[PDB]
């Protein structure tokens, strides 16, 4: 059902894997950051221990931050794949 | 029953064929969401597992929020697949 | 009991076939859509599982809600084939 | 049924191929167009997705607000090319 | 339906294509720029950051701002296209 | 859709690629100072490291200033390419 | 009774394996769910046993919660099976 390598099963296919992939990695993210955060503890603030574990924790929540954007953008390509096929089928199918 | 490739019980069979197709993954994506809904807890709304978990299920969020017009864009391609048949069809079969 | 390619019988035969395989894909669509029905629940309004089902199901309807046209045009192009037919046959029949 | 180059089944036959392209294409258009009016928001006016978002739709708008006059143009085209059949005829069937 | 390369079903066919490309164009731009906005931020009135941020956003926005008088003028082309081949049909079908 | 290289389709498409790759530039500039802002700091007005930072990010200043008048150039060059094209399509079609 | 591997009366022995068969197991999985409830107890509501055993019930109960959806599935494979078996026929009895 399709012209040359567009195919709408296939597309289906597609997206129910990437769906479940993401599933699944939000999932475990999730269960690995509750370990992390009962692991860490806070010493005290302004002791050696606390200016040695700090910034680490802050480049955690940073990155952890920019994952949003992320994943935005990768569901943007999707629709460009759509669209892109979509006129790859119209520009010779008549 | 065509002219060159355009066969109407090969359109039906394909129609089935992505109908079965998208059911299958509404199904096995929701079962599999409740399980995610389960698994995750909300700690607190402040303290480190909550910085280390919130943008997560925001990526969650938003790519889920992205699928429906995927669909959408999906299901539109089939009227246009339909209308060059039909177009193939009147141009040669005078 | 044609010219070339247009057979009677062979034209009742295919509306035959045709009439039966959207009769199968019906029952097979309506009876597994009962099924997908009967397994998704509704969680709550407004809790973590509805925010990750409720676009899924949403393009569900989507989708179904694109087949009537999809069937109406291909009930239209068997009007096309027999029309292409007769005039075949008025051409050079006489 | 003609001299040199006009037919009048071949007029017949051109006249249903464009008026069902542009049927097709404006169905098409058409459930385009809701998806995309469904999938864009209006975020606020004075922030900064609405300096970043506005113009966009004001090319959108303007473009169609463009087609009309094509289409009247298209029309206008074949009542120019039956006459000049008709001149046609008459110049050398004498 | 022409004469040398004037062909009504294939102008039709070019609007169709020019229309739905530019409403992907304009669903793509849009969902982008929602996905922008989020990301930056404003810092403050006049530190560091805002000296450096400002100009990015203020070209951002005249750029856009130059958007829709491109999209008028790519509409204006079309009506000069199709006078130019009615002009071509007259000079010569009679 | 076109004469020799004045494509619609294809300058809509180029639209297309310039908008998102600028949208692109802008999300990564942005992002980028943000980090750079964050990562600088001030000293102190009147020792060392007073005398050896601050030229460097007037410089910083002057450039990011520079930038907007180069966006607007660019969206410039865009309104005289199609105009070209205009002129172009005119010159030789009748 | 058939053409080249669809067989009324295997299909019916067919459907008798698995009614038996189906039979079987529910009896079985019923005779076992009797004596696996007989064997486990209820500690107490918050002592140690209690923190031990509970999940593990929790996911048998689950399980077996899906069974349902399992067997409605494998009923629904015949009707398919029947269908084809039934396209092919006419296929090429004509």
Redesign the interface.
Known sequence: ?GTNGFD??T???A??IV??I??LS??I???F??A???A?SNPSPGTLAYNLTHPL?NG??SF??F??????????T???L??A???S???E??
Chains 1, 2, 3, 4, 5, 6, 7 share one sequence.
């Open positions: 059902f709408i099963p597309i289906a296919i997206l129910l769906g479940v993401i599933g939000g999932l993210l999730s269960i950051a509750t992390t955060a009962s860490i924790i955690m929540v952890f931050s994952f949003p954007t992320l994943y935005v953008l990768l569901g943007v999707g629709i460009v759509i669209a096929g979509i006129i089928i119209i520009m199918k008549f």
